[PDB]
């Protein structure tokens, strides 16, 4: 696997392992803690169905090398949209100017080690791909006469990476990723609404024609987009104020993944700018709460067989029975905090710097049934789906908008309600969790996380859970 990637990224571009030694040597002329070379090539394809036809398709290619020189807090960085000896030399000579002082030159010998495989290394025909989209269109339109528009898309990426560093690290990965997305519009008596579904992971397109609880997966997802659209078409104004909120299993995990997960990234905590800074050993959550970030999940969108620094993905317990245990790291922030790498050093591409980032972030299951949770609420909201939102990790605020939600009245789910924005404090919200369900699920393969302008594929999850008090931004 290292051999196969090396042939494509190095040998095919006129490079050998001794060229890596020479360029790392150029970096180590300066007084540095670390330097690395990061090689990448990818191909992306898409196909889109709309207005009952195959309307569009695209094919996008990128390739390049990025070079870093690191001393304490400091990083110098340069890169090129090509893989060649000249690009490496120019990039290294720019990056190393971060420090003027001479170094001892003593790098560690490059040596690769094994890691666990987490995903495979046209697999389907063009007409078979397009038949997935045609099937989604047919099933969605057949589901209800009010369905007027359907947009369905297929996206696929095949990515190769290789990293070599002054600490001896030599590592490679082969990364597939596919996504099916469906959006529908419904109309009745001049009123219109929309609904959406989809997912995927690190495998081929055949996943979309496999079984999901007795039906073809693509059919199930087409029907779900229609179901969502019709709920929204019927929904009435949401109430306003502080009340109990039951968050559904799966994608609603984005709210705490974002608020708490970003809060526990090591860059913020090393600088002291997170509300969680210096709090290891303290009760930051209800004793019912255990939160993990898990890079090891076979075939998942959010997983990392290695991260972008060559560190294998790990199962990291962040909060355990309410107690803060520690932080997600990259190599730079681990050194400065006196800690070790965790498998969280990720970069959008060769043209961007790595930093501490999430993989698959989720809360562990507890002892309550979802029915028991709903039956405990006299008046509140049940929120099984969200769009997106935003967080402030310094003052500890999150803001997330519902995409499917209902009143709870006298222990029963009742009327569907319109998009409402929930706002609160991450720590206070975790301390308000009084019931944790036995029904853990992750999202279907849809997560996108942004930090400092860099977007990455991630996972989120949780069981059903009860927040005793949370501010709901409705109108009624």
């Amino acid at each position: 696997s290292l051999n196969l990637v090396s042939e494509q990224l190095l040998a095919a571009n006129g490079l050998k392992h001794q060229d890596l030694f020479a360029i790392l040597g150029q970096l180590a002329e300066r007084r540095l803690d670390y330097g690395d070379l990061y090689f990448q090539s990818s191909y992306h394809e898409s196909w889109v169905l709309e207005d009952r036809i195959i309307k569009d398709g695209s094919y996008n290619i990128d390739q390049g090398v990025g070079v870093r020189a690191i001393s304490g807090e400091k990083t110098g960085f340069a890169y090129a949209d090509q893989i060649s000896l000249l690009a490496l030399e120019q990039s290294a000579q720019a990056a190393r100017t971060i420090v003027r002082d001479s170094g001892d030159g003593k790098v560690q010998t490059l040596g690769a080690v094994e890691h666990s495989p987490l995903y495979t290394s046209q697999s389907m025909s063009r007409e078979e791909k397009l038949d997935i989209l045609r099937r989604v269109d047919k099933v969605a339109r057949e589901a209800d006469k009010r369905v007027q528009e359907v947009t369905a898309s297929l996206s696929g990426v095949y990515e190769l990476i290789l990293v070599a560093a002054t600490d001896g690290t030599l590592a490679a990965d082969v990364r597939p990723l596919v996504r099916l997305s469906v959006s529908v519009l419904v109309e009745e008596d001049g009123k219109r609404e929309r609904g959406a579904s989809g997912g995927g992971g690190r495998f081929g397109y055949e996943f979309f024609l496999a079984d999901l609880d007795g039906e073809v997966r693509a059919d199930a997802w087409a029907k779900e987009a229609v179901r969502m659209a019709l709920v929204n078409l019927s929904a009435v104004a949401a109430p306003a104020g502080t009340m109990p909120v039951v968050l559904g299993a799966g994608w609603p995990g984005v709210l705490l993944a974002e608020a708490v997960g970003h809060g526990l990234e090591g860059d913020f905590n090393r600088r002291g700018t997170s509300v969680f800074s210096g709090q290891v050993g303290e009760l930051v959550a209800s004793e019912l709460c255990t939160v993990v970030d898990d890079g090891t999940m076979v075939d998942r969108r959010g997983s990392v067989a290695i991260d972008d620094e060559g560190t294998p993905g790990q199962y990291n317990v962040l909060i355990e029975n309410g107690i803060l245990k520690g932080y997600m790291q990259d190599k730079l922030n681990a050194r400065l905090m006196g800690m070790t790498p965790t498998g969280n050093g990720r970069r959008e591409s060769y043209a961007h710097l790595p930093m501490p980032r999430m993989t698959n972030t989720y809360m562990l299951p507890g002892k309550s049934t979802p029915q028991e949770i709903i039956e405990s609420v006299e008046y509140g909201i049940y929120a099984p789906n969200f769009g997106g939102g935003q967080v402030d990790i310094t003052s500890d605020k999150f803001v997330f908008s519902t995409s499917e939600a209902y009143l709870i009245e006298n222990g029963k789910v009742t009327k569907p309600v319109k998009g409402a924005t929930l706002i609160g404090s991450g720590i206070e919200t975790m301390q308000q969790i009084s019931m944790v369900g036995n029904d853990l699920k992750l999202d279907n393969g849809v997560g996108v996380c942004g930090k400092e302008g860099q977007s990455l594929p991630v996972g989120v999850g949780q069981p059903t859970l009860k927040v005793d008090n949370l501010t709901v931004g409705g109108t009624a």
């Binding site: 959406a196 974002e258 997106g388 939102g389 967080v391 997560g447």
Partner: peptide, 5 residues
């Protein structure tokens, strides 16, 4: 610090 589906 902004996520979505």
């Amino acid at each position: 610090a902004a996520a979505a589906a």
